[model samples]
Target: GLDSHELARLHELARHSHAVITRHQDAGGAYPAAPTFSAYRGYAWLRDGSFTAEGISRYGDVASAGRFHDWVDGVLRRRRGQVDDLLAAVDRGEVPSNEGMLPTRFTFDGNDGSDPWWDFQTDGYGMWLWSVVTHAARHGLDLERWRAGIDVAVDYLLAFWDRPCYDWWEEHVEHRHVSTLGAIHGGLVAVGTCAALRSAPWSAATLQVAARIRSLVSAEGVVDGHLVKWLGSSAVDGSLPACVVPFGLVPPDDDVAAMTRAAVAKDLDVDGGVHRFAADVFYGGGQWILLSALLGWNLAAAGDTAGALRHLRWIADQADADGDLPEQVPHHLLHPGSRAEWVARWGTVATPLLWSHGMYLILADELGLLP
Candidate 1:
């Protein structure tokens, strides 16, 4: 139990996180990654938005969550023909190029942005499947409201899940990442097992592919009893905990889950601020606000309330005077020399990163800290 003043500040941050997220949500329902950050301005990512929607859904903003889903559904529905053509190409033994795949980010209007991007991530599509289904189930809403978009995503993932694409960090497009597979597995299993989605054309196939994903990970995604960054690599990524808690790569109680949590804590966590990885040079591999919350999320799910609270407090300490959280903090830089060039290029770290705030809401809710 925290002191009264500490508890008050935590609750205030929770409320502020809710306000900042809802305030910046686009009128068309997109959650911008960082509205003022030069590189992320005007773009919304399914990876970021899905998690933001989850926090909104958890915080009881049903209307806001529903609007975000409606926006995503519309976006995917427009891609129906494109997914179909991609699937046909796959069936004909002509694996489509990454350029032909659905993008990692889109404009608020649900159109591809004009600028160049590392845009071939499939994780967001998988994440959207999981997010939309979870939102519908949590609020007792109908899956039919999003069925057509779900259909397109299911078809797209069923065809391309095994293809290597960008990871959550938008780096290393050549390796099959365990977290990406975990996202796909979570999405596929969410739809595959849902009673309401049973009649969808891909229902059975979805489960089959999910099983294949699980088998593949079991075979190659583990190193030294913990999940690795990518297949055959022993590096621990901060994103790996998501595979345990929300994604179900393994149950929270599983030995693999415990090992992964320990590995991340030992290798990456520095005084409750977790880095993306040991080698991350982006922004000098600083501690991430969202990764800290993600680890806290897994801790709470495993009944480690004290461990979870430590992370929550660490995150609370990182907020600016205005109570906005940045994408990452530079307190402990892994590569100090690499920091200035990126700053010269991208200006500065993204403040009020909605994903950071979203993750804070999630961890706070997990600890019964939400007000």
Candidate 2:
């Protein structure tokens, strides 16, 4: 499907992405979002790590993926009581504050780190469950290995999935995010359908809530024939395509999926790069490497081979001399004036962003670069 030389470049970048993901994984299996970026140096977001693990899983690094899932399992197993406490608090008609909610980022040792994060996200828990389930199925491993972790996330999401939380971009906590809902729906449905997890008491409940989430999003999240950045907006987010592909808010062939994919392409995509949102200025709203790869993966699934190749090549073009991909490229800054300030604040954009490389591996695998 690719020219011989293009295939060689794909393989080369896939190897680099794989190496970046594995090389920086903590001894305890934490996938740090950006090891060299001072602001995020020592922290790992479950949201980032789940996708990172999924990429490694796709690259056929069974042992490495297993180790990461094992870390998540152990960490969450210890939080069983915290989940129980929060649930009890809810049952008594007293919901916990944001601080009391489960955190999205954690230390390599799996404790909440000192990032002063605007934490309390349900999406990552759901994404982690989804990744773990997918990994086990792909590797033909028993789900029992990470069963406890799955149970914790399942219970936590069941209790809080309806509540508003942070988006994957870690902002706008006040709005009901479609991408967040999609991730939760995918995870709950994933575990709910797993035959190994069927014996669990919460199995039926899981599917029920996932259905409800689909219903709710369908009712409130759709606008102008496509998914939006949040429930009440018309703008597209780079994260939206994920709902159609791997996460499955809708299948890639669905009418809404086609619309969402197109909306992302038209709105967030500039050249082959994708931006998080139209208003993002965190790094001057540059094109995010991972989001571009994500959209490319969706395009490949949607049978847009040439469009997918365009994005894949764009990502490959982003690699620095050392074959490391940065968090975002400044070539087409959505907010140029904001760039220097952020650089002064956090140094240059994070190079070797594991999530960026992780996503490159995922898109590469989607295009069949496995070795």
Candidate 3:
């Protein structure tokens, strides 16, 4: 289905993505968001690690994927007490501020890292749950290995999914994000449907919450028959396509899903490179590799083979001299006027972003190039 060169390059990138993830994974199993990015160093986000693990898993690197889940499971098991404490506090009507909520990123040792980031996102926890469960299924492993950690995440999310926090972009803390809700919905439904987890005490509750999440999103998350970036907002985000595939916000063939894909393509996609949002000025709002892969993933699933391949080629074209994919490329800046300020603040955009590589693998594999 592809030229020999495109096929070869896809394999090359998938292999490189596997190597990058395994090489940069911390000793404790946490995948750093970027090995050397100034702002993201010394921390691991469940959101990024889960997707990274999924990519490695698809690359048939079982050990690497397992180690990442082990790290996340260990860290979350340690958080059981914290989740319990938060639950009890909520029960007592002494709800804590958003600042006191669960952290979105952690040290390799699983401890909360860095100064306050105002990034109290539940999406990572949900993403981690979804990843681990999917990994276990994909590898014929027992969910028992990560059961405790799953319970912790389930409890935490159930207690807090309704509360607004940071979105996947780590912005709009006061708004409930569609992508965040989709991640949570996917995670909850993943555990809810697992036969192994059916015996767990909260299996039914998980399904109930998943249904509620679906209901809430359908009622408020949809606008113009498309999923918006956030509830009550009118913008389509690159991350919204993910909800159409894998996640259960809507099926790929669903009307809302189609509209969302069209809306994202219209508003955010540029030459198969996707922008995060219109107002985004992060590194002058470059085209995100992962977001491109995400959009392609949805396209492929919807049987838009040509369109998906277009994005796959765009990502392959993004590699640097060593075939390393950066986090985002500046080829077409949404806000070219604001690029230099961020370069002055945080250096050039984060190169070799693991999530970028991970999503590349995912898209390549989806296109039947990995095997």
What lDDT tens digits, residue by residue, belong to model 3 across residues 140-215? 9988888888989999998888888888987888899989999999999999999989888888998899888888
Question: TM-scores for all candidates?
Answer: 0.98, 0.98, 0.98
lDDT of 2: 0.88
Candidate 1 Cα lDDT to native: 0.92
- Which lDDT values do the candidates have, in the order given? 0.92, 0.88, 0.88
Question: What ranges in model 1 sit over 4 Å off?
Answer: 114-117
Q: Which residue ranges in model 2 land beyond 4 Å of their true spot?
A: 114-117
Candidate 1 lDDT by residue in tens digits, 72-125:
999999999988888888889998788777877798998886322355788888
Task: Score candidate 3 by TM-score against the native.
Answer: 0.98
Question: Candidate 3: where are CA atoms >4 Å away?
Answer: 115-117
The C-alpha RMSD in Å for every predicted model, in order, reads: 1.2, 1.2, 1.1
Candidate 2 global TM-score: 0.98
